[PDB]
Structure formats: structure tokens, C-alpha cells
Amino acid sequence: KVFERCELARTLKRLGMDGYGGISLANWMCLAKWESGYNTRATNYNAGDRSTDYGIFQINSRYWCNDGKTPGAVNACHLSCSALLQDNIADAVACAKRVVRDPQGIRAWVAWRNRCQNRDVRQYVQGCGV
């Protein structure tokens, strides 16, 4: 599923993402936007390390989910990577919450540092009623 901007903003809010780990909803929107264009079935194979990024938040198979084909990988979210390709994003959100409990927080996603950190992200939630 490819979410519309405001539809996703309210979806993430209902899932408890607003201010989760000190991260505003606008930051999560900016992350999803730049990671997948709000598309839950987005995937990106990384030929260099044989891992794959899954879903709306492009969560990586080396550490967060199990796809059975990433060498020496772990599964910290204790989910099948398939769970991150569902139209319903509850599992992806629970995993994204787990990701930010690590030392880096939202900085774990390099794209957030590239297109969201120290940027004006208010635009992602304006008019969404969140």
C-alpha cells in the first residue's frame, strides 16, 4: 500500500508514534517519505552485504528481521521481514520503535540524517489534524 501523507500521519499517531523516544510525528513522516515514498512494499537489496531493506521504513535484514537469506544476520524485532511488507503497518511501527531504543535513536537511518535532521519538517504534518 502507498499511503497518502495525512492518512499516514494519523495512522502513525494512532499507533503511538507521536513523541515516541522524543521523536516528533513530523520526523517519522520525513523518515517514511525519504525511505519509501510511503510505500509498504518497498524493498531494496544491498548487493554489497547481501542484506535487504524492507517496507515503509526500509528496515534492514541484517539486524532487525529474519528473511533467511542474509548471512550471519540477527532478528532483534523478532519478526519475519515479510511482516514489514504488510499493508497494515502495526508491525513495522513496533519494529521502528525497537530500532530507536538503540544508541543512535532516529539517527540509525542515514536517510533521516541526510534529509530530515536540522531541517524544517513541519510540512509533513501540516493540515493532517495530528
UniProtKB/Swiss-Prot annotation:
Disulphide bonds in the chain: C6-C128, C30-C116, C65-C81, C77-C95
UniProt keyword annotations, A-Z: Amyloid, Amyloidosis, Antimicrobial, Bacteriolytic enzyme, Disease variant, Disulfide bond, Glycosidase, Hydrolase, Secreted, Signal
Span of domain C-type lysozyme: 1-130
Swiss-Prot/TrEMBL GO biological process terms: antimicrobial humoral response; defense response to bacterium; defense response to Gram-negative bacterium; defense response to Gram-positive bacterium; inflammatory response; killing of cells of another organism
Record-linked CDD domains: LYZ_C
SMART domains, sorted: LYZ1 (SM00263)
Keyword Hydrolase: yes
Catalysed reaction, written as an equation: Hydrolysis of (1->4)-beta-linkages between N-acetylmuramic acid and N-acetyl-D-glucosamine residues in a peptidoglycan and between N-acetyl-D-glucosamine residues in chitodextrins
GO molecular function list: identical protein binding; lysozyme activity
UniProt-annotated catalytic positions: E35, D53
Top-level EC class: hydrolase
A GO-annotated cellular component: extracellular region
InterPro entries: Glyco_hydro_22, Glyco_hydro_22_CS, Glyco_hydro_22_lys, Lysozyme-like_dom_sf
Location(s), subcellular: Secreted
Superkingdom of the source species: Eukaryota
Catalytic activity, EC: 3.2.1.17
Stated family: Belongs to the glycosyl hydrolase 22 family.
Function: Lysozymes have primarily a bacteriolytic function; those in tissues and body fluids are associated with the monocyte-macrophage system and enhance the activity of immunoagents.
Note: Lysozyme C is capable of both hydrolysis and transglycosylation; it also shows a slight esterase activity. It acts rapidly on both peptide-substituted and unsubstituted peptidoglycan, and slowly on chitin oligosaccharides.
Assembly and interaction partners: Monomer.
Entry's disease: Amyloidosis, hereditary systemic 5: A form of hereditary systemic amyloidosis, a disorder characterized by amyloid deposition in multiple tissues resulting in a wide clinical spectrum. AMYLD5 primarily affects the viscera, and the predominant clinical features are renal dysfunction of varying severity, and intra-abdominal bleeding. Inheritance is autosomal dominant.
Protein's name according to its UniProt entry: Lysozyme C
Gene name, Swiss-Prot/TrEMBL: LYZ
